[PDB]
Design a protein around this ligand. Structure first.
Ligand SMILES: Nc1cccc(Oc2ccccn2)c1
Length: 209
């Protein structure tokens, strides 16, 4: 059973701007997704400080980066707090309507696209490099769900029958044909060192056969 939803007009506009604006510094998508993972990990850590059972779904707090050249996917996995179905529908747990308004007001006052994360909508920078994004998520208070969008104004949500995750979020980037540099180990390492060198959780870059 698949449910199809329309993005709010402002979010559709944000996505079309990210997809259609000429902007060469696309590598920031990875910084933004790693930052979102760090924020999700901080949230489950904080909840566990007063309720240790919150980590019964998994004690390890980490971020994995998994390139797959056969599938042309880069996957960012974290064991953070995850998202409920309601969170997914509500713009992946963001205040994206007001964040988009603040971002676009900053742009017309001289900011650039790389500042997107300051407005709480950094997730959508995935569309700098991905033609389709799949988000698999499990929150302690809900079942495992898959969100997906190829932009174009709509997204889908379905219960996920795939591999159980325990707790956290997996962002699967189905990369555009001309963005395969982001599957190369040396390129990913360079971006992580440039922008994420201080993230307070272990980041493991998986290698391929
Ligand atoms: N998400 C996150 C949080 C804290 C530090 C960090 O790493 C950084 C930050 C700036 C420059 C180099 N490394 C990343």
């Amino acid at each position: 059973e698949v449910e199809t939803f329309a993005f709010q007009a402002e979010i559709a506009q944000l996505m079309s701007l990210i997809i259609n604006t000429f902007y060469s510094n696309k590598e920031i998508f990875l910084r933004e997704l790693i930052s979102n993972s760090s924020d999700a990990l901080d949230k489950i850590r904080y909840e566990s400080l007063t309720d240790p059972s919150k980590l019964d779904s998994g004690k390890e707090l980490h971020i994995n980066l998994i390139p797959n050249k056969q599938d042309r996917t880069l996957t960012i996995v974290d064991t953070g707090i995850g998202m409920t179905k309601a969170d997914l529908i509500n713009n992946l747990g963001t205040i994206a309507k007001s964040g988009t308004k603040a971002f676009m007001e900053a742009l017309q006052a001289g900011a650039d696209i790389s500042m997107i994360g300051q407005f709480g909508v950094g997730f959508y920078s995935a569309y700098l490099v991905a033609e389709k994004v799949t988000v698999i998520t499990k929150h302690n208070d809900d079942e495992q769900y898959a969100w997906e969008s190829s932009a174009g104004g709509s997204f889908t949500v379905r219960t996920d029958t795939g591999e159980p995750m325990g707790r956290g979020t997996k962002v699967i980037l189905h990369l555009k044909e001309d963005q395969t540099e982001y599957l190369e180990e040396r390129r990913i390492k360079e971006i992580v060192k440039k922008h994420s060198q201080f993230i307070g959780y272990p980041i493991t870059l998986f290698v391929e056969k």
